[PDB]
Design a protein around this ligand. Structure first.
Ligand SMILES: O=c1ccn([C@@H]2O[C@H](COP(=O)(O)OP(=O)(O)OP(=O)(O)O)[C@@H](O)[C@H]2O)c(=O)[nH]1
Ligand SMILES: [Mg+2]
Ligand SMILES: [Mg+2]
Length: 476
RNA sequence: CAUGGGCCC
RNA sequence: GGGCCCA
């Protein structure tokens, strides 16, 4: 992203709330190199010299500009994908009624009833509870006012910045690498779902290598479907982006919308518009009013869908900018936002692709830094998608999401107040794939003070998930 | 603590 | 109507 006119005003929205993640009985047992990212400008852990209001906005290195040469290529790559995509999802992308946009549709969860209302909804001390009724499916006064405004391309707004209170690595938390969230007005999210909600709903229920999207999947069951796929390709790459969602160049974003959400595909005219209102965003941090021209807001509806689409276009635009005669079937991939997994028989050289992604403002890097460079010969059982690996379950011979033990430990070391028991159960369905032994150790610190489900009770549950008949015919 | 999926209720 | 994980 690129800043242009940083300034100050009056109102000072505070979000540096004291961390709400308290150590658990397991913490002192695992001593994870992780901890809640410093949310205060003057946090003890912070290094003597590093600033908060500084590092946080140090993700905007500018907005890479493109040439008429590159633009044309990206647009074509975005057109080819758009064609390939809609040739599956169909052309049924008509707008959704104010009702549908709320209560959601088949393949699209409803809107959050108790979340950040946005702005000025925040300064007016009024939350969604005093703006829209998520039960009958209708908006209130303030909201509808915007609808008639957004339906006329005259809706201005500002994004509210938040300091995500999460568990990050000490090295990152120490350097003050606290991730920030960009909250947009609730009406903006409501209209977005109206313009391209039918799309996302179809995008979700069709996740896979084909449309190259993993949005709307469940690792516990789809890992078997994804595994087999990338299991039959000469090479597999575990690419890594640096501030992916914050480096999308204005050119790429616009051209992407102009080619993917065309009315030609059954989309409502105001589909392209409502999406572009994300390029030049006006973030608001306390008394500051930073203006950015580029990147994607860390809180806009269908944020993952956009990233996934772009991520899909970049891989094409990249490979095509190096070779000639590259097609969407020249390689296979899938992604959920920035995290991506590519594969192909051709010994593609991603190393020589780095410069090409740079034209778009992205910086690709291998997830296996141990090699310091993109090498070949790697299979799917070597990469990691969504903090999950791809291991062959000795039991049912299926593929199962296996998170790193160190990652799980850090997860079982922190939690909100009076939410332990809950997390313990949720996370339990994640460690089951770490084998019986690990599942026991990981939950050892909570034995005698909480209810820990048996490794088997969760295992069977999983089997009946990956394949209901797998556990059924297991009796015959 | 937003966006979205998924899971746990 | 909560919580959790990934993004
Ligand atoms: O609060 C949040 C949570 C998630 N996200 C978004 O979700 C995605 C998850 O991505 P990452 O945030 O995982 O990569 P990183 O910055 O840790 O990169 P390096 O330090 O290693 O270079 C990012 O690409 C980010 O845009 C936010 O912007 N804010
Ligand atoms: Mg990354
Ligand atoms: Mg990865």
């Amino acid at each position: 992203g690129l800043i242009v006119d940083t300034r100050d005003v009056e109102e000072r929205v505070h979000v540096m709330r004291k961390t709400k993640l308290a150590p658990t009985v397991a913490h002192g047992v695992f001593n994870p190199e992780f901890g809640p990212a410093a949310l205060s400008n003057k946090d003890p852990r912070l290094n003597e010299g590093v600033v908060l209001d500084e590092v946080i906005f140090s993700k905007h290195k500018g907005d890479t500009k493109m040439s008429a040469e590159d633009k044309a290529l990206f647009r074509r790559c975005a057109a080819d994908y758009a064609s390939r995509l809609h040739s599956v999802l169909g052309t049924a992308n008509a707008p959704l009624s104010i009702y549908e946009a709320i209560k959601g549709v088949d393949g699209l969860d409803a809107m959050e009833p108790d979340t950040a209302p946005g702005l000025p909804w925040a300064l007016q001390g009024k939350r969604r509870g005093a703006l829209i009724d998520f039960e009958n499916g209708t908006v209130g006064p303030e909201v509808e006012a915007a609808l008639k405004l957004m339906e006329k391309r005259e809706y201005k707004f500002a994004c509210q910045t938040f300091l995500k209170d999460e568990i990050r690595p000490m090295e990152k938390v120490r350097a003050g690498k606290t991730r920030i969230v960009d909250v947009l007005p609730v009406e903006h999210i409501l209209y977005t779902r109206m313009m391209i909600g039918r799309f996302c709903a179809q995008m979700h229920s069709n996740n896979g290598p084909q449309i190259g999207s993993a949005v709307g999947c469940n690792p516990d069951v789809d890992w078997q479907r994804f595994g087999t796929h990338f299991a039959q390709y000469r090479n597999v790459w575990d690419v890594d982006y640096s501030a992916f969602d914050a480096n999308h160049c204005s050119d790429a974003m616009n051209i992407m919308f102009e080619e993917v959400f065309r009315t030609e595909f059954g989309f409502h005219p105001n589909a392209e518009w409502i999406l572009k209102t994300l390029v030049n965003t006006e973030h608001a941090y306390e008394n500051k009013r930073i203006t950015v021209e580029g990147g994607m807001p860390s809180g806009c509806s269908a944020t993952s869908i956009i990233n996934t689409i772009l991520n899909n276009i970049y891989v094409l635009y990249a490979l095509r900018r190096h070779y000639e005669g590259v097609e969407l079937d020249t390689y296979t991939m899938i992604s959920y936002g920035d995290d991506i997994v590519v594969a192909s028989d051709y010994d593609l050289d991603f190393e020589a692709l780095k410069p090409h992604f740079k034209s778009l403002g992205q910086t690709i890097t291998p997830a296996d830094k141990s090699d310091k460079g993109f090498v070949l010969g790697h299979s799917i059982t070597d990469v990691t998608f969504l903090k999950r690996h791809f291991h062959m379950d000795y039991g049912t011979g299926f593929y199962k999401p296996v998170m790193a033990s160190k990652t799980l430990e850090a997860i079982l070391s922190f939690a909100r107040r009076g939410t332990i028991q809950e997390k313990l159960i949720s996370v339990a369905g994640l460690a089951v794939h770490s084998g019986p032994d690990e599942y026991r150790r990981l939950f050892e610190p909570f034995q005698g003070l909480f209810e820990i489900p048996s490794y088997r009770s969760l295992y069977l549950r999983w089997v009946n998930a990956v394949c209901g008949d797998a556990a059924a015919l297991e009796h015959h």
